[model samples]
Target: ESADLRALAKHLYDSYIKSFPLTKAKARAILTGKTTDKSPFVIYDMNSLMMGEDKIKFKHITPLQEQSKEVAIRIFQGCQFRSVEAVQEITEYAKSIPGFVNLDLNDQVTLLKYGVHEIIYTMLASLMNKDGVLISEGQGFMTREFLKSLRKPFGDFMEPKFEFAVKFNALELDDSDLAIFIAVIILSGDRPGLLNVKPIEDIQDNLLQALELQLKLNHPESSQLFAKLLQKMTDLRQIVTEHVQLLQVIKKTETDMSLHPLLQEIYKDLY
Candidate 1:
């Protein structure tokens, strides 16, 4: 049965991989500084660092904008793009998870609503390292120090993510492992509004078993990997909760800034 579940893992992984705006090869090249392209990267996947028919290289690099307001506005827009992108990717991924679509319609959205932030931060590990995140795929990079330089609340928004990403990246998970891990997040039975608990719990347990098997297969010598990841899962939940609270404050104080409607919908019940 676990072997059969690995097939499920692969199915969900395929769905997750196709949603990326950038090709894995180019994303790797850019992250490794193997790409000499100076073009400014564009956001396609809400998404990539790769060149393709649907992709365009950045034309020129713009220095980070000045002013707390200006920087906050820019970062907020960037976050909106990614959050919208994450929701779509997560929805598609969740839909493919065995038993996911059969859940009550309200329960399905509830799972997505609570789980997107966790998935978003987890996927962010792809674009970030210990210091900063690669912006617009690989076109721009934002340093932790630079982000910290932003005034007050704007700086607050990214710090937790950077902290989480830096730690999450250390696990060295690839897309395959992430696919099952994501299934575990979205099908969580603990999500507050779930109308169908037993089915979701069974689904989550199946994913947990798959993840344990997958982790062992991926990291044979790491005896503690699965337990460590469970801890990280809890950490992810707290980070998203804090993030929602912070965004609530930002929305109130930054009257000039507006959130994308998609992101607004995701955050709607979170407060």
Candidate 2:
């Protein structure tokens, strides 16, 4: 059973992580980039990306806007929208895995429902360089400085995540290592609304074991790194919980955007 899940995990590794490496010169940057600067990593670059079609601007944040709550929510809504690869890669990798698509359609949807945001944030770490992540393809980034500059809940929201990202990037995990790590994140047992929780849980357990092995091979010198990654999962859980609370606050304020129905449903009980 572990082997079966491991097979699926390794397949997903080959499927997605190999295809994207944050940036083309990621390996070189790993050696040369500055992740620990007391300053921000992402600098606001207006030349490459405008706040227009992308549904956001360098400055549209929750706390500082002198606009209605609706407008703020709308702007906040845009931030959640992800890149095509970031959007598709999860489902694509899910389908490629032997265990996922084979499950009932409901379970398949359930995993994607809860797993997507967490995985999105997780994979976003890969795109991070020393100071910030690549927000757009054309060398555009929203510096750590800009994110911190946003006031109130918005700035508070991203601090833990960026904190995690800075440390995660420092680890210098290669694509091969991230592959299994991402798989473990997707096929989780803890997600709500799973009709077939037991079978999926088994798959997740196997993938976790597989990733443990891969980490052992990948980070032989840092024996504690795998355990640390396990801790990051808990940190991720906390970050996403705060994110949901932020959404609830927005919704309760009657601030509305076209919040995706699925996202609304995901937080229905809490929101």
Find the candidate with the highest TM-score and give its number: 1
**Residue 120 deviation, candidate 1, in Å?**
0.6
RMSD of each: 5.6, 6.3
- Compose the digit string of candidate 1's lDDT tens values, residues 197-238: 999999888889989989999889888899999999989988
Per-residue lDDT tens digits for candidate 2, residues 1-271, read: 5566456556766676545545334533542545633322234533222343233344454322323343324335545554334556677777765577788898887787777777777777765544555654423455665555555556666556678777777776777677777777888877777777888888777777777877777689986888888888888777777777876775676534555554555553432
- Tell me the spans in candidate 1 whose CA falls farther than 4 Å from its real position: 21-26, 35-69
**lDDT measured at residue 204 in model 1 versus the true structure, 0 to 100:** 89
Following a full C-alpha superposition, what root-mean-square deviation does model 2 have from the true structure?
Answer: 6.3
- Tell me the lDDT of candidate 1: 0.74
| Winning model by lDDT | 1
lDDT of each: 0.74, 0.63
Alpha-carbon shift of residue 117 in model 2 (angstroms): 2.1
